[PDB]
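Hey,

Quick one before I head out. I ran the complex with sodium ion overnight. Inputs first:
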Amino acid sequence: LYFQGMPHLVIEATANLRLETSPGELLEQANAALFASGQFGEADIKSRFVTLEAYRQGTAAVERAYLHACLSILDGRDAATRQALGESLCEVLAGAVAGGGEEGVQVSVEVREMERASYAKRVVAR
Amino acid sequence: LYFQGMPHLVIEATANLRLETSPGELLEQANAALFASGQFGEADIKSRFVTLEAYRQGTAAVERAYLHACLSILDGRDAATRQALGESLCEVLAGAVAGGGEEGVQVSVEVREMERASYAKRVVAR
Amino acid sequence: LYFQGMPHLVIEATANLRLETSPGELLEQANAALFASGQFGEADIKSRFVTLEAYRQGTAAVERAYLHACLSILDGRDAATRQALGESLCEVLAGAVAGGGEEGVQVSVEVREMERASYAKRVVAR
Ligand code: NA
Ligand code: NA
């Protein structure tokens, strides 16, 4: 069996962030966005949403919220590919933000590469 | 005291994943496998396991579970070294899976590199 | 409107680690140290603290605690800059350790780089 076994997507949200969707819906939407790229197998996109309970942004005594994602793909794609993927996620994430804290909400997406030569993967059958 | 201060190993398991071992036992087996490589000081191998409470694999309405590790080592080793480390961990992780969701469980391991020139470390004495 | 949208700082502490102050206060100290570098916008420094409940260090049956941070900045800075940033954080972290386990506490800091060409960012207005 040949399978990509990636991408891995980790979405971190401060506990005070308010979204327009449930976390499940956000994960669904992020995964649909990634699948729509045509670069990934449907069952290979593996995403998680992590609530941050202990966070600080800057030094000011200002209530703030933030939302960050890190998309990890296999090495080898070109710059334009990586940039497009990050932008497609950022659109999904930014669109899901209802609000949080007492000012605007920073949304960021990193796209990073995993060394495919050393990436190990298996499926453990049911 | 000269010490490596690494590697760092992070294991992530979806909340629906059943294992044959406790998380702590799985960490012990992973650390044993890493120490058996002969590449690391005994006290320098630092591992942690996290359960992902909010996750989604793909878009299909199929219950799925997955297990992932990210091993971080200092830069400067060759490709063969990195590949071998990842394979060793992948065998441990795959061995630990009992089952989850309604189909097979994808297991993956990334081996990544940390810039040793900027890596800061200290031992705060007892 | 123009904003850095980073750095991102993740601090991980074993559950048995005793700190001189709370996790919130440690995050404040870390953010203050990063801001004092003169390299970052005040609102762009985004930090979070995780307590690790399932952790193992080495293979020996000895109680041990550890503390690790990963600072992620945009690619492009020189070696001396990355090293200085890591050292500044390492000082803060090391100074926060009261104790933990039955021997010294390993403290470490990785400084890693995100690809700026693919890094996507937005502020969702209030
Ligand atoms: Na991981
Ligand atoms: Na985190």
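The pocket of sodium ion (ligand 1) is lined by residues B 10, 12, 68-70 (CB under 6 Å).

Talk tomorrow,
K.
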